[PDB]
Design a binder for this molecule. Sequence first.
Ligand SMILES: Nc1ncnc2c1ncn2[C@@H]1O[C@H](COP(=O)(O)OP(=O)(O)OP(=O)(O)O)[C@@H](O)[C@H]1O
Ligand SMILES: Nc1ncnc2c1ncn2[C@@H]1O[C@H](COP(=O)(O)OP(=O)(O)OP(=O)(O)O)[C@@H](O)[C@H]1O
Ligand SMILES: [Mg+2]
Ligand SMILES: [Mg+2]
Lengths: 269, 270
Amino acid sequence: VFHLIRNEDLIFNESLGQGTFTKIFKGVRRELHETEVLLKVLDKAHRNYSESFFEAASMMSKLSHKHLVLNYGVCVCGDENILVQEFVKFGSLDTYLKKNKNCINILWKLEVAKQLAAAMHFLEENTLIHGNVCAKNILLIREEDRKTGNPPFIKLSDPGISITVLPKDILQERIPWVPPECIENPKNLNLATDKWSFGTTLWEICSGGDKPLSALDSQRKLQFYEDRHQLPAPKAAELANLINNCMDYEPDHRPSFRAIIRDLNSLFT
Amino acid sequence: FHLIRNEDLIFNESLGQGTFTKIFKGVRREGQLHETEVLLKVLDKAHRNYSESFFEAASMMSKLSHKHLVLNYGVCVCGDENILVQEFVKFGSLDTYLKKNKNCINILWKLEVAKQLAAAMHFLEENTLIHGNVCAKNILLIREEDRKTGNPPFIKLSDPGISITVLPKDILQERIPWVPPECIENPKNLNLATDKWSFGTTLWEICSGGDKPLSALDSQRKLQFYEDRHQLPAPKAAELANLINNCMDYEPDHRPSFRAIIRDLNSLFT
Ligand SMILES: Nc1ncnc2c1ncn2[C@@H]1O[C@H](COP(=O)(O)OP(=O)(O)OP(=O)(O)O)[C@@H](O)[C@H]1O
Ligand SMILES: Nc1ncnc2c1ncn2[C@@H]1O[C@H](COP(=O)(O)OP(=O)(O)OP(=O)(O)O)[C@@H](O)[C@H]1O
Ligand SMILES: [Mg+2]
Ligand SMILES: [Mg+2]
């Protein structure tokens, strides 16, 4: 479901901040059914990024999976082209991780990875490239009910603005999420890209929400890939092996999400 | 509502302009190749306020299928621009075709076209779908009449374009007599009855060898025509004068249904 949602049917509320060329607001849609939704308002300055920001969310709308956020449609809401998608109560994971680095143990982290890998495998099967996998773009639907054992639940946000059109300056600032082959030529974006980013994303999860290579600058980030280094194993290096397998400078050596799911399940609960 | 990547769109010839649109013959690119001939309508950023209407004009035009409706492959929220991708009908608009071969077309040729048109309108009426801009221009000729092969012409109805519910009154008044009197005094009166009126006027074009009714009248003399409650003169052929008037009934509730319009057209043996 990807419809041309009208500005008349959208009510904006509180702003959740801004992002990569977007202003984020909580709102409501009127279809009569009123439904809470997330509104990513593409700034008018960067309005030329719409041909990929929304076309990607569109293809993700055609597919169905319990771990893919629902992208409802688009609005030519005035001077801005806006994305209307499902709202997630607890927001991005990268923040939730840092806010609860201690309480979050190994079992909690493992279930999240399984849920993510499931969505990535789904995308791989459907051959849909995300291009922006990261603990930021992972949204927490449900917390862990320890006393009841209820597992957490996550949903993968929309693909976003393609890295095939973003400026090279921000691509280098996005290392180690943007894989090497894409830094070399952005037109190398392929399914293998998300495997690398999955490794970087897994590092975030194991690191209690920390950010890989936050201290380095773009030039030093460029050298890390030049020297073909690898991310360090977090303080809880139970998954360190799988990270490096995904962050493999040879794209064809990065394991399929089918095999990755097996590894994750092999780690027991 | 399918979104296409701009790179896949290859502009070529320019087919003039439409209602706040620049028309281009182009190609779609899409695994080996995938070169599809298409029609490109570009909505300027100066006219971004007509986005919802310009898009919705083709959105619902595609949610259903019919052999006499043009197929819209997709659109682009291309940022600065907004583009519509639809099938390219070879021979172009019917109004022009009728004039280019005015002294060479017969009634059976014209009547066959009317039935095809009514068929499309009937399909739309059943689905509670309003076109809003029925005219010989928005009618595109797929195939010519092959006398030797004894096969008929074929046509399709293009999208409505930007809805008259948002166009300026100056445009509406100039679109008379295609805009029904009830919409000239309130565009929000647009309903299924609007198309029956517009259909009758479109038939008048067909019978007139491609000419356009009320051409030598300004928008002010056109307004008096509706105020005086006049009717369009009978065509030189004079076969469908009644059906036109029946369709162009100043009372919307009395305008016939396309179900019945098809019977009368089928009833016209000639
Ligand atoms: N679907 C959503 N539901 C709830 N909160 C969301 C949703 N999408 C984004 N957010 C919130 O947006 C903030 C982060 O936005 P973010 O930077 O990911 O936006 P963006 O423009 O999509 O970025 P990018 O395309 O670079 O990933 C966080 O508060 C996150 O909780
Ligand atoms: N689908 C099509 N296939 C082939 N030619 C087309 C098609 N649509 C338009 N054209 C050509 O474009 C010319 C002008 O187009 P037209 O005026 O119908 O555009 P428009 O933007 O749809 O306008 P309007 O909103 O006023 O109906 C037509 O005479 C015809 O030559
Ligand atoms: Mg995001
Ligand atoms: Mg048209």
